[PDB]
């Protein structure tokens, strides 16, 4: 659980009122909690599992209540299963609690292994929203139709008899908002978000690449409604690395039924992509991210400078004008550096000239080369 989002950002008493509303509610929480049976069930089960209980691994289930369990010493024991253990929650590789004296299975322990993919499960999408992105409307509708609508409303596709699209590639110059759009769609539909950065699936170990992608899809399907993001797919996209490609392509198209997990893959060099990975059967949605135009640039300037204190003299149009020379990330860079420049000369209220010299210096640092 998390706090509500207070949506004035200028210092106004509306922001205050929302805040003291929240304080009121949390204070009622405090009040309520401070102003303060099944011993039969406990006396049977939690006394049968006499403390302490060891933790081991389940290998096989042989009978209805008989299973093989290994422990951290590595020994193997054919033990019985007490009736209260959920059989459907038991499978090879599962962590199981065991009676200390007689090693009898006394319950399943929720998994705490596979650390790395557990970290890349992130789920920490809520920093952005479709709000934070402006002007990418065509891309927004495309990705909504491809991945967001089938997750939010698969009813349309099931009623239509349609098997939903099962792969999306995002492409364009860097800093156009591909990663931002992926995070934003992860935020709009609260399906679990999976991110893995390109080259990081390339590994020294021969198996580790395909193994890593296999376990990532395994955890994704385990979370069921999930979105997996591979940024800079080019690192793999453009024998061992080709074998990781084959693993990913078969995880996309191949045997079994994948189900609900969606795949977003972002590239900066789409034309260098190999034909196999761009599967017409799987990857039917390619979304271009062009360099922002005048309207989009204006929207990005408003979005980013919105949280900054601004003077009256700022004429945003001369910043917007000229051509499509730069992307949204460059716009954020101009906003930030204009903030610093206003800070040096001691303005907490950035002016037009600040942005003018900021864009000039950025264009100086933008590209290079002898005449």
């Amino acid at each position: 659980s998390k706090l509500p989002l207070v949506t004035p950002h200028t210092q106004c008493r509306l922001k205050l009122l929302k805040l003291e509303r929240i304080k009121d509610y949390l204070l009622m929480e405090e009040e309520f909690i401070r102003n303060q049976k099944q011993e039969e069930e406990r006396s049977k089960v939690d006394d049968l599992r006499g403390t302490p209980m060891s933790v081991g691994t389940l290998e096989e289930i042989i009978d209805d209540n008989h299973a093989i369990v290994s422990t951290s010493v590595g020994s193997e024991h054919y033990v019985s299963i007490l009736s209260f253990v959920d059989k459907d929650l038991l499978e090879p590789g599962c962590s199981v609690l065991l009676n200390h004296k007689v090693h009898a299975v006394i319950g399943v322990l929720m998994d705490d292994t596979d650390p790395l993919v557990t970290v890349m499960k992130v789920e920490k999408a809520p920093q952005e929203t479709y709000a934070d992105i402006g002007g990418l409307d065509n891309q927004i509708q495309e990705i909504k139709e491809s991945v967001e609508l089938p997750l939010t409303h698969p009813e349309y596709y099931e009623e239509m008899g349609i098997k939903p699209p099962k792969g999306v590639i995002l492409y364009g110059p860097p800093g156009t908002g591909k990663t931002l759009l992926a995070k934003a769609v992860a935020n709009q539909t609260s399906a679990t978000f999976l991110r893995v950065v390109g080259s990081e699936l390339i590994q020294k170990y021969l198996g580790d690449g395909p193994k890593l992608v296999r376990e990532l899809f395994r955890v994704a399907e385990e979370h069921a409604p999930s979105i997996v993001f591979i940024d800079e797919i080019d690192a793999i996209g453009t024998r061992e690395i080709q074998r990781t490609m084959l693993e990913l392509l078969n995880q996309l198209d191949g045997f079994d039924s994948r189900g609900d997990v969606k795949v977003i893959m972002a590239t900066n060099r789409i034309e260098t992509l190999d034909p196999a990975l761009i599967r017409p059967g799987r990857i039917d949605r390619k979304i271009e991210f062009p360099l922002p135009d005048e309207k989009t640039k204006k929207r990005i300037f408003q979005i980013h400078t919105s949280r900054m204190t601004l003077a009256d003299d700022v004429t945003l149009d001369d910043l917007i004008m000229a051509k499509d020379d730069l992307s949204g990330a460059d716009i954020k860079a101009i906003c930030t550096e204009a903030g610093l420049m206003a800070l040096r000369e001691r303005r907490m209220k950035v002016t037009n000239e600040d942005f003018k010299k900021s864009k000039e210096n950025v264009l100086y640092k933008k590209q290079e080369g002898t005449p």
């Binding site: 392509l249 078969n250 799987r282």
Partner: protein, 407 residues
């Protein structure tokens, strides 16, 4: 410009505030501290355990069995001494623990115990009493499909000859062994599927698995390729043993190009380990000892890349080609894909097929889906021929995607 002296930041963060600053930051710190107080007051969240619905379980039988039976350890059997066959004596290996010389129980029988055989044993006398199944590697046993895909041969379009010839080998002998045995012929035992990507090879594998009725095991290139040496060969050994356990079995390799790469040496030893795994496989398919009732399916996008020993008949007896569908095949697959949708009755599909260039069946499903999204984005509950033509245009132009090198 001089750096920000402490007074300068002080006045910067004081003069520029609204007349609200103090209140709302203090209120935010109270937000944080009250959140932490709530968290400490409610305590940590109960992680819990299994504990199936309460009415389902327990009975005094649970505790009675717990206090009456024995938590048997598991030991590899070995070298039945059989010194006089009136009391044979056995050797057991408790992994990472010890090696013992033991005897049977009053319950089990000498005929019930074999060498190896992965027996169970008591915890203090180490007397042997239970017949346990052998150790199958979990990453090999999850490979069994355990669930048929929702695809039948009728869903495969155009490739009548291919499906006929593949069913001749993977389905007919299991379904009708009498035809082969009474005519006295040995059917083929290995079918290779090759063709361009997206032609329906994995779809045919899914259809076979759905209609197999026997034990069907999928296999993917990544599964075999472990990191440690010999381990992939080990898994294939266990996989073929598992297949032998079943009364007949079907083995499917998807994209065997991942492992079947032709052996090469001058590349400073090359990949080698993958070659070693495919060599263990090439032996298991046909080496010493008959393979058994194990019919095997491989599909690959690079038929020429696999090692010639793997192409060899007797291991890969029948090779099938899935080419780009013809006009009739394109019409048939368009019909098949359009069965599931809510569309106009008068969609002249053969027109769409002849608009299609040399498009694989994956392209056909893609354009059908793109028509689906056209209809849905139009909010119409019926897909129209106009939707199908926009879908064809979209898919074809997207695949087509300066270029002044042209003419």
């Amino acid at each position: 410009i001089r750096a920000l002296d402490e007074g300068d930041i002080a006045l910067l963060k004081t003069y520029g505030q609204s007349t609200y600053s103090r209140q709302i930051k203090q209120v935010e710190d109270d937000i944080q501290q009250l959140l932490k107080k709530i968290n400490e007051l409610t305590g940590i969240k109960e992680s819990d355990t299994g504990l199936a619905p309460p009415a389902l379980w327990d009975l005094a039988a649970d505790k009675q069995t717990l206090q009456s039976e024995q938590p048997l350890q598991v030991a590899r059997c070995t070298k039945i001494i059989n010194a006089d066959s009136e009391d044979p004596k056995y050797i057991i290996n408790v992994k990472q623990f010890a090696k013992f010389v033991v005897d049977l129980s009053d319950q089990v029988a000498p005929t019930d115990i074999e060498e190896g055989m992965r027996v169970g044993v008591d915890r203090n006398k180490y007397q042997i009493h239970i017949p346990l199944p052998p150790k199958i590697d979990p990453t090999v046993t999850m490979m069994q499909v355990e669930e048929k895909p929702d695809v039948t041969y009728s869903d495969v379009g155009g490739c009548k000859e291919q499906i006929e010839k593949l069913r001749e080998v993977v389905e007919t002998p299991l379904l009708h062994p009498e035809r082969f045995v009474n005519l006295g012929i040995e059917p083929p035992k290995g079918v290779l599927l090759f063709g361009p990507p997206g032609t329906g090879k994995t779809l045919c594998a899914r259809a076979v698995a759905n209609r197999t009725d026997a034990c069907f095991i999928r296999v993917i290139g990544s599964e075999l390729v472990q990191k440690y040496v010999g381990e992939g060969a080990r898994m294939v050994r266990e996989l073929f043993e598992m297949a032998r356990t079943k009364k007949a079995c079907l083995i499917f390799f998807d994209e065997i190009d991942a492992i079947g790469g032709a052996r090469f040496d001058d590349g400073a030893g090359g990949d080698n380990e993958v070659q070693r795994t495919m060599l263990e496989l090439i032996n298991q398919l046909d080496g010493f000892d008959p393979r058994g009732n194990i019919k095997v399916l491989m599909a690959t996008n690079r038929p020429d890349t696999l090692d010639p020993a793997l192409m060899r008949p007797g291991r890969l007896d029948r090779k099938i080609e899935f080419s780009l569908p013809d006009l009739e095949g394109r019409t048939h697959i368009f019909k098949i894909h359009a069965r599931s949708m809510s569309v106009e009755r008068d969609i002249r599909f053969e027109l769409l097929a002849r608009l299609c260039p040399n498009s694989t069946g994956a392209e056909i499903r893609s354009v059908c889906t793109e028509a689906g999204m056209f209809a849905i984005r139009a909010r119409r509950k019926i897909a129209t021929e106009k939707d199908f033509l926009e879908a064809v245009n979209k898919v074809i132009k997207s695949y087509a995607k300066r270029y002044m090198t042209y003419n």
